[PDB]
Design an enzyme around this catalytic site. Structure first.
Site, PDB file in Angstrom:
ATOM      1  N   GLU A 165      30.277  34.139  28.621  1.00 10.39           N
ATOM      2  CA  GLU A 165      29.720  35.502  28.767  1.00 10.39           C
ATOM      3  C   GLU A 165      30.404  36.391  27.722  1.00 10.39           C
ATOM      4  OE1 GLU A 165      30.307  36.346  32.969  1.00 10.39           O
ATOM      5  OE2 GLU A 165      28.366  35.456  33.509  1.00 10.39           O
ATOM      6  N   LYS A 199      41.800  42.613  46.227  1.00  7.69           N
ATOM      7  CA  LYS A 199      41.248  43.955  46.569  1.00  7.69           C
ATOM      8  C   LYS A 199      42.240  44.704  47.463  1.00  7.69           C
ATOM      9  CE  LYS A 199      36.489  42.404  46.009  1.00  7.69           C
ATOM     10  NZ  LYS A 199      35.312  41.896  46.753  1.00  7.69           N
ATOM     11  N   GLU A 246      27.746  40.293  43.599  1.00 13.85           N
ATOM     12  CA  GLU A 246      28.843  40.876  42.775  1.00 13.85           C
ATOM     13  C   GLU A 246      28.342  41.189  41.359  1.00 13.85           C
ATOM     14  OE1 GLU A 246      32.782  39.362  42.595  1.00 13.85           O
ATOM     15  OE2 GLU A 246      32.461  38.146  44.426  1.00 13.85           O
ATOM     16  N   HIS A 284      33.878  46.992  39.472  1.00 17.60           N
ATOM     17  CA  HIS A 284      33.436  45.920  40.383  1.00 17.60           C
ATOM     18  C   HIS A 284      32.559  46.584  41.436  1.00 17.60           C
ATOM     19  CE1 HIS A 284      34.676  42.148  42.903  1.00 17.60           C
ATOM     20  NE2 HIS A 284      33.529  41.969  42.260  1.00 17.60           N
ATOM     21  N   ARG A 330      28.604  34.872  52.427  1.00 19.98           N
ATOM     22  CA  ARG A 330      29.443  35.036  53.637  1.00 19.98           C
ATOM     23  C   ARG A 330      29.497  36.525  53.982  1.00 19.98           C
ATOM     24  NH1 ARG A 330      33.247  34.767  49.135  1.00 19.98           N
ATOM     25  NH2 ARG A 330      34.617  36.590  49.228  1.00 19.98           N
ATOM     26  N   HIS A 359      43.486  40.014  41.263  1.00 18.56           N
ATOM     27  CA  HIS A 359      42.409  39.382  42.070  1.00 18.56           C
ATOM     28  C   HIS A 359      42.543  39.658  43.569  1.00 18.56           C
ATOM     29  CE1 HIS A 359      41.303  37.751  38.318  1.00 18.56           C
ATOM     30  NE2 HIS A 359      42.549  37.275  38.166  1.00 18.56           N
TER      31      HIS A 359
HETATM   32  N1  LIG Z   1      32.013  38.734  31.636  1.00 23.32           N
HETATM   33  C1  LIG Z   1      33.118  39.169  32.254  1.00 23.32           C
HETATM   34  N2  LIG Z   1      33.788  40.255  31.790  1.00 23.32           N
HETATM   35  C2  LIG Z   1      34.938  40.715  32.466  1.00 23.32           C
HETATM   36  C3  LIG Z   1      35.383  40.034  33.591  1.00 23.32           C
HETATM   37  C4  LIG Z   1      36.514  40.440  34.309  1.00 23.32           C
HETATM   38  C5  LIG Z   1      36.922  39.718  35.435  1.00 23.32           C
HETATM   39  C6  LIG Z   1      38.050  40.173  36.144  1.00 23.32           C
HETATM   40  C7  LIG Z   1      39.359  39.980  35.690  1.00 23.32           C
HETATM   41  C8  LIG Z   1      40.450  40.434  36.436  1.00 23.32           C
HETATM   42  C9  LIG Z   1      40.236  41.093  37.650  1.00 23.32           C
HETATM   43  C10 LIG Z   1      38.934  41.288  38.121  1.00 23.32           C
HETATM   44  C11 LIG Z   1      38.724  41.953  39.334  1.00 23.32           C
HETATM   45  C12 LIG Z   1      37.423  42.164  39.804  1.00 23.32           C
HETATM   46  C13 LIG Z   1      36.333  41.716  39.060  1.00 23.32           C
HETATM   47  C14 LIG Z   1      36.535  41.056  37.849  1.00 23.32           C
HETATM   48  C15 LIG Z   1      37.836  40.845  37.364  1.00 23.32           C
HETATM   49  C16 LIG Z   1      36.155  38.585  35.849  1.00 23.32           C
HETATM   50  N3  LIG Z   1      36.422  37.774  36.916  1.00 23.32           N
HETATM   51  C17 LIG Z   1      37.626  37.708  37.831  1.00 23.32           C
HETATM   52  C18 LIG Z   1      37.508  36.368  38.463  1.00 23.32           C
HETATM   53  C19 LIG Z   1      36.047  35.966  38.295  1.00 23.32           C
HETATM   54  N4  LIG Z   1      35.282  36.106  39.546  1.00 23.32           N
HETATM   55  C20 LIG Z   1      35.564  36.778  37.250  1.00 23.32           C
HETATM   56  N5  LIG Z   1      35.067  38.241  35.108  1.00 23.32           N
HETATM   57  C21 LIG Z   1      34.661  38.916  34.022  1.00 23.32           C
HETATM   58  N6  LIG Z   1      33.555  38.519  33.360  1.00 23.32           N
HETATM   59 CA   LIG Z   2      32.886  35.667  44.514  1.00 21.10          CA
END
Ligand SMILES: Nc1ncc2cc(-c3cccc4ccccc34)c(N3CC[C@@H](N)C3)nc2n1
Ligand SMILES: [Ca+2]
Ligand SMILES: Nc1ncc2cc(-c3cccc4ccccc34)c(N3CC[C@@H](N)C3)nc2n1
Ligand SMILES: [Ca+2]
EC number: 6.3.4.14
Lengths: 445, 445
Positions: A201, A238, A276, A209, A292, A236
């Site tokens: 991506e 919340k 999400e 978020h 869930r 990671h």
């Molecule tokens: N294309 C793109 N850009 C930025 C991102 C930033 C994160 C990310 C990185 C670090 C903490 C986070 C907290 C909530 C949501 C996302 C993040 C992320 N994550 C965190 C774990 C996984 N579920 C995906 N993906 C991302 N994808």
């Molecule tokens: Ca998830």
């Protein structure tokens, strides 16, 4: 309209599920580890079965013992809550094959939305906007990969399809680095998940978020229940959630929500779920789906009047959702603070005896906790002890009520993260609203 | 928009008032007896002043000490809560003469609605329906009295104008008895209240107690906020309240509510108030007005979304009511159980140490209490320790949530009336709704 439900979980969510069951006249079976005999929901349940010793692997993840519990009690359904087996398709498969209703989607659909590549494929096919990317897995042909990355624009991010929680993620800032990052991510993915599948991506540098709550029933109905901003997080985990997301208009909600509801019907989704998104520069980008009920479901309940766990139970019994999309109006604002038995600076777990609990109350204050005066927080599981939820007619009222409720709260004999909540709530950037996912770590640094 | 408020009260309502003050950024002065130093709201207040020893007459009824508290703190206003001095016009007079705002009506209007005869006169003039009666005080000319009684029809009831709480009330079933009943009631009235004024009403044998909540502001606005059914009572002590009143249609509410709002403007009413009606044979009959916030105000809050104590504070600061009549929609149903430190059969007070408190929570559960683990319930004041309030989309959900919340509640080291609530909530007549004011005493007999 199920007669007996196995609560295949613990702590606050097991109590939340018991309360929904009791309101509907549904009998409760509490399956519990040796260490959770004094859990509040165990003490309240119609029936109790010890499913093994304290470690999670031997108790809450024990598929044979949980299914045998439903068998000996003559239960009709199993509610997996969140965490543990809630997104384990093998568990869901064994539950329906064994003649019980799994309170959640079909095993096929858990696996489909569980795999990040197949999930994105399906959302893309439904017209749900996704992060620009490889749109499928990447090759080992680096020439193809560099052209993909070039199209999207650096920085890009390589992700494991079988990944999650930040394990199988690599940011790439320049082309000269792309080749090994794909190969390394691929190697750690196969080593970890026995699944070397990876995608690219665009890497969004400062997103929020934002997640959309849905229900879909066995009557072909699917609804969206606005959205939550869960940006206030650390590595990671919340910390504070809110609903609705600041800056989101009713016009934008209806567009992105209806695409989510439409995707539910397309994929034959069933039960509660969460789309999400990363939200950046006024645009939504689907990243993944939770199949869930979630920790932060109460903030959606407080702004829509919907009982999400009760809708789970209705949908599982084969009933339609109790309302229609046009019946849902967003009213006011809600905040949730996850109260954890942990050091407020080191985040080291703080197990031990709660000598004194004083829970807050009054107008617009909701307390979801299994914790009681004289309860011992065990070492074996997560640190969450309570969710403090406030409602207000405005975001400002919700925040001020959370500040006042936290100042009333006393948890004596263990450390909690209440001092961290108080720092967050009085932060001027947070009071303005719309801080990104990295903000709390910067503030703490 | 007042800067500093004296909370001239104690227990749960003092905490309710403090929470409203804190939400609005209003400074708090807790005036307290020697016995109430460990009250939760005292511990939370910005400032505290001891106004005398434990007995009510020497502390909460001490007008000079309360006014001196406002004087030395430079307070702007005094909130009297309910009971104590809240309906004492002499207190209200001294407060405005001393340069402070009384959170309530003008002294003139407290006295007018405080006197039952002048109150009925004013409601009658406003077109609010009243019990058929003498329409003014009765003579000593028994010939006149018998003709009045004959017109109305037996049984009739003789009431002291300065009466209340069942003291100065005599039912009369036949004419041969009327003469001495007037003369006796007159004699006990002059002896008790130094006020021999008495009136006759028709005696309603099986009414419901239905009361209408209003607000009126200094901008000429007056609103009605549906109604409460407070019929579930024992010897003048309310036990369970609910909103809305079962069997009341939106059409009937708008008619009786608008007459109440209109009467507020006619009499120059200011602040929160309650029109008390007897409801029998599908008709409303005004009996008396409360010029104060009431114990059971939370059930109105839960079905209308209105913060009644916050509206009190706005109105006192000279602001308009924050919404208009057309903005108010009744949604769902709410129940309140008054939890008392008393024997559940003898109703003897049960003072002493609460060794363990476990307060319930979850969706649609509200807890308004100053009580905490290790708090000692004192002997000197009333027995109320908590109000447990539930909301549901239907009356049935509200009742079931109250049953489940009561079963979770633990108050260790004193007796409570929780077993009485549980008896009431599972009663089949109560589940059907609409039981009259005598029902609980019959059930208990
Ligand atoms: N294309 C793109 N850009 C930025 C991102 C930033 C994160 C990310 C990185 C670090 C903490 C986070 C907290 C909530 C949501 C996302 C993040 C992320 N994550 C965190 C774990 C996984 N579920 C995906 N993906 C991302 N994808
Ligand atoms: Ca998830
Ligand atoms: N014309 C007429 N008919 C029946 C009544 C019955 C009562 C009464 C008597 C006993 C308990 C009550 C509880 C709630 C409401 C009223 C009552 C009553 N009361 C109780 C004290 C005082 N406020 C008036 N007045 C009544 N008036
Ligand atoms: Ca009264």
């Amino acid at each position: 309209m199920l007669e007996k439900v196995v609560i295949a979980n613990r702590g606050e969510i097991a109590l939340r599920i018991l309360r929904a069951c009791k309101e509907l006249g549904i009998k409760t079976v509490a399956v519990h580890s040796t260490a959770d005999r004094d859990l509040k929901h165990v003490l309240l349940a119609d029936e109790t079965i010890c499913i093994g010793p304290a470690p999670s692997a031997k108790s809450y993840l024990n598929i044979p013992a949980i299914i045998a519990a439903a068998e000996v009690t003559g239960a009709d359904a199993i509610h997996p809550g969140y965490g543990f087996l809630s997104e384990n398709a093998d568990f869901a498969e064994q539950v329906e094959r064994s003649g019980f209703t799994f309170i959640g989607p079909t095993a096929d659909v858990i696996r489909l939305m569980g795999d990040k590549v197949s999930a994105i494929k399906a959302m893309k096919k439904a017209g749900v906007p996704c992060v620009p990317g490889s749109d499928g897995p990447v090759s080992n042909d680096i020439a193809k990969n560099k052209e993909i990355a070039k199209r999207i624009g650096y920085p890009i991010i390589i992700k494991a399809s079988g990944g999650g929680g930040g394990r199988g993620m690599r940011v790439v800032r320049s082309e000269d680095a792309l080749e090994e990052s794909i190969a390394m991510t691929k190697a750690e993915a196969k080593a970890a998940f026995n699944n070397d599948m990876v995608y690219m991506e665009k890497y969004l540098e400062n997103p929020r978020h934002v997640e959309i709550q849905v229900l879909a029933d066995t009557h072909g109905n699917a609804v969206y229940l606005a959205e939550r901003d869960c940006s206030m997080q650390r590595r990671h985990q919340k910390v504070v959630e809110e609903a609705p997301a600041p800056g989101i208009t009713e016009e934008v909600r209806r567009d992105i929500g209806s695409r989510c509801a439409n995707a539910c019907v397309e994929i034959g989704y069933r039960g509660a779920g969460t789309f999400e998104f990363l939200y950046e520069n006024g645009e939504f980008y689907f990243i993944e789906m939770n199949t869930r009920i979630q920790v932060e479901h109460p903030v959606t309940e407080m702004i829509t009047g919907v009982d999400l766990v009760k809708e789970q139970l209705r949908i599982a019994a084969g009933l339609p959702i109790s309302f229609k999309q046009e019946d849902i109006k967003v009213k006011g604002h809600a905040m949730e603070c996850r109260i954890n038995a942990e050091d407020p600076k080191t985040f080291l777990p703080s197990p031990g005896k709660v000598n004194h609990l004083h829970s807050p109350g009054g107008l617009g204050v909701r307390w979801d906790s299994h914790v009681y005066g004289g309860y011992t927080v065990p070492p074996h599981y997560d640190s969450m002890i309570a969710k403090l939820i406030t409602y207000g007619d405005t975001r400002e009222v919700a925040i001020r009520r959370m500040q006042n409720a936290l100042s009333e709260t006393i948890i004596d004999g263990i450390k909690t993260n209440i001092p961290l909540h108080e720092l967050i709530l009085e932060d001027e950037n947070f009071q303005k609203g719309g801080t990104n996912i990295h903000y709390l770590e910067k503030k703490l640094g």
